[PDB]
Amino acid sequence: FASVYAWNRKRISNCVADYSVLYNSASFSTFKCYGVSPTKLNDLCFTNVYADSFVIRGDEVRQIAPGQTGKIADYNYKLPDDFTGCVIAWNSNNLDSKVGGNYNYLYRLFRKSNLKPFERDISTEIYQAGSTPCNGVEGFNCYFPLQSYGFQPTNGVGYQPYRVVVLSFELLHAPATVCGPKKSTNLVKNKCVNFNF
């Protein structure tokens, strides 16, 4: 997966999306839909779907929602206040946590100002807490801005890594785009019928 402070961003495009294989997979620990309840996804069409991916702690999945606060939603990944998509999350302790501590999953814990929604910040400047110029060196009130989850397999739930995917359906002003599949039927040759082609 991708870090939490530099999430990924895949722009799903024109295709045939089947959110039912997602919705009923029962492997997801969290499947919340906000703009639109889940069962009506396979019956609507938008312009673009974006999918963002990252990895967080177990008990920070409640900050991936419109209108929250905390070190994740403040400055790592902010969701607008009229979100439309759905948020999916599942535990991944066996893949991402390794004995001795997996120190490759970082997050940002200091920033000047909270993020704008869907804004991204991969800089690595020394956070200047004190008026004293940091000059680019560490010290009191001059802190490196990135910390690392040290994940370990013997962690209580709520400290084990969860993988998160945020689908965001957007509708600019194009002519059309991706929509859900559509079943059909057979042919009843010789039988006054009510049809839709």
């Epitope: 920033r111 200047q128 807490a129 008026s131 910390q147 040290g150």
Partner: antibody
Framework: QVQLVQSGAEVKKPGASVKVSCKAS????????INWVRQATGQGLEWMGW????????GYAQKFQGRVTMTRNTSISTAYMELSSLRSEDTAVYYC???????????????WGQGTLVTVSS | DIVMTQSPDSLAVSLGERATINCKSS????????????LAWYQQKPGQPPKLLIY???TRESGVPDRFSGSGSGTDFTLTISSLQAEDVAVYYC?????????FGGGTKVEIKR
């Protein structure tokens, strides 16, 4: 949880050396600077902050220099302190604290060690 | 350099009173628009490690009831606990921040009536 565990309430003879430990828990460890203070019998405190999560250059209080050495281990996040050439008036109690920070500027020390005892005298 | 001289000492006054502990040296307003302050208040029970009280000088008490209440300015300030009650008998130090070391000294006891 947010804790600090010290150990080593002990007695030394003058002209010797001592190592003191502070065990941490409930945090990422390498993310908040450890700061130790002295405290005599019914007096004030001192010892400026120093040391950092990663590597950390470490500082000092400029009247304690040379005798002071700060060593830690990334095996569990346990900061220590090595004092040397004791002069039988440095007998005091010694503390630990996490010095927590928050967006703007850190606000005082997060936790507070349980303290320890060093008694120097022949 | 910056000496935190605290004037009052042993304010052994009847509970509920309103102590006023002053100290100052060599301002630490700290630029960067963060015009707040730079020094916490502390409480150390006798035979105990210290604890944390008002910080930023900005009343910012944490798990701490309202009677303990700070104030602040550029150089001078005060803790000013209100409606003091039994078990607030401690020693109350100050801070310095970007400075280097610390400095402070204060406490109370009782007074009685007879």
């Amino acid at each position: 949880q947010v804790q600090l565990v010290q150990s080593g309430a002990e007695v030394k003879k003058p002209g010797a050396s001592v190592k003191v430990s502070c065990k941490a828990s409930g945090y990422t460890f390498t993310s908040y600077d450890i700061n130790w203070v002295r405290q005599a019998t019914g007096q004030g405190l001192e010892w400026m902050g120093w040391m950092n999560p990663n590597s950390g250059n470490t500082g000092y209080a400029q009247k304690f220099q040379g005798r002071v050495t700060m060593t830690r281990n990334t095996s569990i996040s346990t900061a220590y302190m090595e004092l040397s050439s004791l002069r039988s008036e440095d007998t005091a109690v010694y503390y630990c604290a996490r010095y927590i920070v928050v967006v703007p500027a850190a606000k005082g020390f997060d936790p507070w060690g349980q303290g320890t005892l060093v008694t120097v005298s022949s | 350099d910056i000496v935190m001289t605290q004037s009052p000492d042993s304010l052994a006054v009847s509970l509920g009173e309103r102590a006023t502990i002053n100290c100052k040296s060599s301002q630490s307003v700290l630029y960067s628009s963060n015009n707040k302050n730079y020094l916490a208040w502390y409480q150390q029970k006798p035979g105990q490690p210290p604890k944390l009280l008002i910080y930023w000088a900005s009343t910012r008490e944490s798990g701490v009831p309202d009677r303990f209440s700070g104030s602040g300015s550029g150089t001078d300030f005060t803790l000013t606990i209100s409606s003091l009650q039994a078990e607030d008998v401690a020693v109350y130090y100050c801070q310095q921040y970007y400075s280097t070391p610390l400095t402070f000294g204060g406490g109370t006891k009782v007074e009685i009536k007879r």
